[PDB]
Symmetry: D2
Subunit: 169 residues, 4 copies
């Protein structure tokens, strides 16, 4: 019912996307990270392919995705890769690709670690398609807060810290 | 008469007309978004007039020269925090094609604001897209006070004040670039 | 008691600063405009000397000046000119020069249209020193709202608009 | 032993230690400011741990090579709205000289926040400036999981996993640049 990828798998996901890019002859000049789920994949992919330029976008998904801020300079004539962690509906990556296009880049391609089966728009690069609810390492405590019955490690150490946090407000 | 060269006095009345039209329509903006850099002077003046304290900016340019860019205005940067639930007014100086205000209105909508409305001082009759608020509809080449020297450098035959002083300064400037 | 510069004088102020720059052999690569008083001088100076690159800083003066946001990209190895409309205490220009320095530019110089007699830090470029309270064209209605007895033009047309504005909230 | 190569497991415990130290000190940040790009992974993980929803960023770099820049960290961009009255935590991955966290703390102070405090995962004993919160004090070269390939490209003799797979990818990469 749950897919809980290890860090070891996350690295494998980054490798696969990296290789796919090199074999497709698409070496990005600029990485656009989707805040905040794309933060960690973008950084890892940056280190792998030696991509020194990373920019960011603050977009949240509510009926439609909403941009809160755009953290980038001129992207004109550049090859851009948008990176998020999981494409569920696919609307987020589409919305980001839509706004980045307005920057007149050479090309915008999209990427995600995992894909959901019935997404409207499929990313250009991805590792695997999973039919389960995905618990990333960087949002595990977000899930435990909604349901502490999920099978994740170090849950006891969290709840002790969690309680003390609530004993303040 | 070929060029329309509006005085600073006309610019003020242009700003007043917009502000008055805003109050009549009961649309007091929570945020002013200035189009860089042609609309940053109308935005500032309108801000002072209606006591609008929040001003944000967008760096967008439109090269109409032929023609390595398939038309389309080009965004270089967007300078703003969240605009969700906010009433937004976009301000530029002239709607020639109405395509810049079109491009800005589209990206601001993605911020999910309560409402976006556009405004430009002048409008061309051939402008495909029309701003919500505008002062006057002109059919001639407009030389603004904040781009007159840009025009002078492009055409030295324009009848503008203090030109002789500029050219001297310009000559000293080219001698060291 | 009041100094109320015409637009004609403002242009003269921009000219003087422009010439001073050219004769000092300091042609700025980037203009940093101080929001929002430096907005209009920076634009005019940009048009005069053909300076295509303008960036901005949102700083407000309360006991000390406060930065709200900084709107600029990399300034490394560039000649920077900070532009504001009036230097009263001089603390604002100093604070902006202090933060811009952290961007490792080639050089930071400051400029203002008018200077006040007893400022702590004097700008590098300025038009005139005035001992009176200055009412700029772009903040005249800010002064009328604090005191509608000031001798400025079009005051009647404002107050009629002003009233209708108050008849809403 | 020459390099310290922390596992993802150690990184998590490093983040936990900070979070626990934050609660003990009764300092729950209103805003997390990540140092780009070394601290953007600790910031995200700490954010998830303590349910901190507001994250801002600063693009600052420190070239320690000799030596056309008189030392000093160099700010390239600051990505944040107003921080006035806010409790702020700055997050980087390692305090080697403590000069970056020093430079960031100085510019954030000018935003007049309620309070700024700093935090780094690791600390060097020769670090002139000490972070408020840190996990462990290391005296060796640290190879983080998010910069291991950067180190490999600089020194190919480092004992890191999946290196053979990287080098193949690297060879295909250099053949088309």
């Amino acid at each position: 019912e749950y897919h809980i990828p290890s860090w070891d798998e996350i690295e494998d996901a980054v490798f696969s996307i990296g290789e796919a890019l090199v074999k497709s002859n698409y070496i990005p000049d600029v990485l656009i990270a989707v805040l905040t789920g794309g933060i960690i994949p973008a950084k890892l992919l940056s280190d792998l392919l030696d991509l020194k330029v990373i920019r960011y976008i603050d977009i949240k998904f509510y009926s439609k995705p909403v941009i809160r801020s755009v953290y980038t300079d001129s992207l004109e004539g550049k090859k851009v890769l948008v990176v998020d962690d999981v494409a569920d509906t696919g609307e987020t990556l589409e919305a980001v690709s839509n706004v980045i296009t307005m920057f007149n880049p050479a090309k915008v391609m999209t990427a995600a670690l995992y894909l959901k089966p019935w997404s409207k728009r499929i990313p250009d690069f991805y590792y695997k398609q999973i039919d389960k609810w995905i618990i990333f390492p960087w949002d595990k405590w977000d899930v435990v807060r909604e349901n502490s019955n999920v099978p994740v490690d170090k849950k006891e150490r969290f709840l002790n810290l969690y309680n003390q946090l609530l004993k303040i407000r």
